[PDB]
Every structure is written in structure tokens, then in C-alpha cells.
Design brief:
binds cacodylate ion; tau protein binding (chains A, B); cytoplasm (chains A, B); 4 helices; binds calcium ion; binds the ligand CCCCC#Cc1ccc(C(=O)NNC(=S)NC)o1; homodimer; Recoverin, domain 1
Chain lengths: 88, 88
């Protein structure tokens, strides 16, 4: 179904980005930035400044380790979906 | 992108199911049951018993109003994705 498709897309995109460098299970700042810029260009403004990279991670980073893990990525997804859900 | 596709699929599926009866913004038990049975047949066992319908809603229903709203649907999605994410 389309829902099952969306579930595996969420898994797949996190993984193409998280596995690039360092911890293959977490998104560092440069990997988060590339995900947003390449994969969310219709929902979010392109990130061009280091201070925005820094602030975005600061916001997503619930447990405070400096990176975005899968659960944190999932909360980020829920935020965008809710924002899109109620624009309409 | 495939991620933006997944975001709009999440919105769309909740809405086709929630708007069927009563509150057009919330999933009652029969609407939740149909969503899981029709749209999650590869991830979850088909629900055939009222006690399972009752227990599933009890689990998803964080604020205690007897129905599943959008934020609660989003937490349910995060649970299935995490379960699927780490099966592999
Ligand atoms: C082509 C679709 C564009 C039409 C549209 C839209 C729209 C309104 C608000 C958002 C959005 O996702 N923002 N996310 C935020 S503010 N951060 C969590 O997206
Ligand atoms: C065709 C794919 C089947 C292969 C597979 C798989 C798989 C393992 C675990 C789950 C799952 O989503 N369970 N969700 C639960 S337990 N409730 C929150 O799915
Ligand atoms: C070694 As690689 C292509 O996952 O950065
Ligand atoms: C009136 As209807 C087709 O949204 O249940
Ligand atoms: Ca990484
Ligand atoms: Ca973190
Ligand atoms: Ca309803
Ligand atoms: Ca509820």
C-alpha cells in the first residue's frame, strides 16, 4: 500500500544519509544539512548558513549527543507532517 | 522526492480513514481497524477480534478521549517504522 511505501521510504532516506560518515546509524550536521537540502526542497528553505545547520541540529537533538539518531529523525518527520497537515 | 511523497501519503491515508464517520479529524475504533487491515497488511496481523481493536486504541490513545487524532497516528507510524527499522 501507499502507507507501507511511506514507512520504507522513511527508513531508506535516513539510511542513505546517516551512513555517509562517522556513526552509520546517526546523522551528523553535514548529513542532516544535505538531507534537508536534497530531499525537502519543497517543504523547507535551503540551508546555506552554518548558524542554521547548528540551530536545526540543536532543535532536533533531544538527548544531547550532537547528532540526530533515528527516533529524533522520526520526531522531525512528525513536525513537518503536522506543519504540512494544517497548512491545509 | 521520495521523502516528500511519504509525508503526503501519511496525511492522505489518515484523512481517507478519519473522515468516514463522526469527527472528520479523528479515527474512531472501526476506522482505525479498517486502516490497519487494508493499509498495513504486510506489517501487522489482520485484526479480527473486538478485544484487539479495543486494546490497539487503548495503546494509541494518549490523551484519553477514546479516539486516535493526528499526533497519535504519527506516534503509531513512528512505532511501526522503528519496529521495521530494527528487524533489519
Ligand atoms: C509544495 C508544497 C508547499 C506548500 C506547503 C507547505 C507548508 C506549510 C508549512 C510547511 C512545513 O512543512 N513547514 N515545516 C516547518 S515550519 N518545520 C517543522 O509546509
Ligand atoms: C514485507 C515486510 C515484512 C518483514 C518485516 C517486518 C517486521 C518486523 C516487525 C515489524 C512491525 O512493523 N511490527 N510492528 C509492531 S510490532 N507494532 C508497533 O515488521
Ligand atoms: C563508505 As560510504 C560510500 O557509506 O560514505
Ligand atoms: C460522508 As463520507 C463518504 O466522508 O463518510
Ligand atoms: Ca553518519
Ligand atoms: Ca541526538
Ligand atoms: Ca472519524
Ligand atoms: Ca486520543
Amino acid at each position: 500500500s501507499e502507507l507501507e511505501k511511506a514507512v520504507v521510504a522513511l527508513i531508506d532516506v535516513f539510511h542513505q544519509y546517516s551512513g555517509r560518515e562517522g556513526d552509520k546509524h546517526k546523522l551528523k550536521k553535514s548529513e542532516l544539512k544535505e538531507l534537508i537540502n536534497n530531499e525537502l526542497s519543497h517543504f523547507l528553505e535551503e540551508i546555506k548558513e552554518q548558524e542554521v545547520v547548528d540551530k536545526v541540529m540543536e532543535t532536533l537533538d533531544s538527548d544531547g549527543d550532537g547528532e540526530c539518531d533515528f527516533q529524533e529523525f522520526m520526531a522531525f518527520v512528525a513536525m513537518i507532517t503536522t506543519a504540512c497537515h494544517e497548512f491545509f
